[PDB]
Amino acid sequence: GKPAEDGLKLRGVALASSGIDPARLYLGNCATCHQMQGKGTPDGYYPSLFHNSTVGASNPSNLVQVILNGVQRKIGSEDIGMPAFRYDLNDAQIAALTNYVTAQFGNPAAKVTEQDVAKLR
């Protein structure tokens, strides 16, 4: 992958009225965790998703899989967890976000997820 800058020019610009704007989907739904540029915080914790496995695989079923539910790593009597997006995102909203993610982070070639979202629910 590589640092985004996608939002670098998206700050101060009023929010769109209707239609999936994948760029802003990451900004509002994510960034606050993986950070605007997708670099992830210093002390690892929430990782940078521009040099991740799941983010850039080939068949991103395991990718969206996370966006839907989240993660539950309970090991080390100090457990983690990326929250849920099953009730706060639509199959179209998710699929359009996935395509943005992969394309601008992972190897976009196999980055499909064309309403495979619903089937994953």
Added chain:
Amino acid sequence: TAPLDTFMTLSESLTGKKGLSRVIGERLLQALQKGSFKTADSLPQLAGALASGSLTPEQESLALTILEAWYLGIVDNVVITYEEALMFGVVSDTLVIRSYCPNKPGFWADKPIERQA
């Protein structure tokens, strides 16, 4: 030599920072000026006065604006930049910025690592 290279290298002179994103620098540029060049010029003329002797009063007012534009990230009461806003990355070591999580939970337990000291 576009009215943008002049600004960038005029900004690094005032901000004292290196690696400023020209993407932001242009937005700041657009907002600092109107649809005009009257602002796009006089930059070179300024860089000379600054990186030399005394500065003419109203030549200072121009600089002061370029500073605020970069640090605060708002010009004419409009947010052009918030994350890259230069005031947030002068004590960093790990950037804070309100609305974004630095490191992880317990991060705020121990004493912050003051920078340039």
Added chain:
Amino acid sequence: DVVVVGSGVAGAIVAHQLAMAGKAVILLEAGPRMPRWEIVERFRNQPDKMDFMAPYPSSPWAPHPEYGPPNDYLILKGEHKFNSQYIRAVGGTTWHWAASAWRFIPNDFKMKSVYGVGRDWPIQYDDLEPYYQRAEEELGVWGPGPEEDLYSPRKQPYPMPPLPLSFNEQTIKTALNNYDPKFHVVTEPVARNSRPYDGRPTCCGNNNCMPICPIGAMYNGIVHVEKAERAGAKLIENAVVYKLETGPDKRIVAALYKDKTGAEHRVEGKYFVLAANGIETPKILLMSANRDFPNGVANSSDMVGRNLMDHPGTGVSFYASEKLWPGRGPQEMTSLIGFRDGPFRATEAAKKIHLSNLSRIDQETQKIFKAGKLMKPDELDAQIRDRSARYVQFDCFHEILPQPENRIVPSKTATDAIGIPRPEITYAIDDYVKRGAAHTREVYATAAKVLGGTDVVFNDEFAPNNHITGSTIMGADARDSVVDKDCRTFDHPNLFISSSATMPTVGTVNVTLTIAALALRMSDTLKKEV
């Protein structure tokens, strides 16, 4: 079966409970449903990030207070303007709250029967203790262990432990504690996740509590509105209720609302739950008036809208002798619960003082630039870290007595877009609070001298803390009240009020937890009848 008006924490819970009981429910929501992601970006885009209502647009049909700039949606008159704020949108005002989950101390539930001022509750603390915990279990609240005495007897410990305190809050905690133990500075009980809880995440020092958490780490009314819909509850967004209709059995049979267009609709149910906010609940009541109840439904007492209360706040800002770096962690984790109680409380009011853990590099940077004097980037940065690190601010809650002269009535002139009369609030601050603030200022001056303060600034303007209470007072008899101890209205059997309006005393803390408990109270009550 049950028709709940307002999808705020209060109503949200009620809907969920009976929704679980297998009862058919209807949740009526005045404003529209704004999703998490959208709100954050609005904020990130706003030039003033100290205006906590800004990122919540006041939809013409369901307007609410906005002071950036003033949308003058509230008609204020009297001695002091009641410039409080709420959020009309699917999720309630808990979208922009600080998540400070405080319990009312026993003595709060018997003020006149102890200090001989204000009014007593028809219930005592030990009556709400079991519900208080259930409220801490539903919201997901972290709070200190026995070691820290919150003076509210616990039958069971908090469901979550508190994460480490901010270097700023831990420093000033110890500094003052070791000076005078009477200040009794303790870890604040709050609805913030100290660990992945309720399927949600854990705090990552977003320091954005107000105006919003972009994770769900802390509790937001929306959590139960969700759980509510998943239970079977039918939620109707953009259904601004304006009138309630009665049947010969002085019972409420239907409520009418206007959609975005202003087109009046009618909703029939068996039981009714008035889960609007402190100003909106009394407005609907003082609006449904008919020949059966000329003074407005459940207002035979003429107490509806009256006895309005909200902590008249008072703060202090100075530059400490030592670096503290406020912004590393939640906006508030410390609370000086020293003067929450005591005999004097029969003269001046008791206050809870809270240390500010908000980022000030935003404000402090601006303060330097406002100087309008050019300086090299070495001297600039030097002042930025020097100012933003050493900045400390103390805000506090004062208690004002429930007074009938303080009231909320629908203006008989002014009206909103869809043509509903807009809230006209007449508020004034008695000397009972003035004397309390006076001694509260002596504590501020001392807190300064201890933390080696410089440029000490005193905020002597009573600030709104946005805790609307006493609109639909609770009492024993119906000649000086509106609802009984069951949160039921004397006038209408099947009408229930789930809001801070039902709270007789405002106390010394944030009321939301008290509200969530009372909500769960009714839940079990309504759950047996229907």
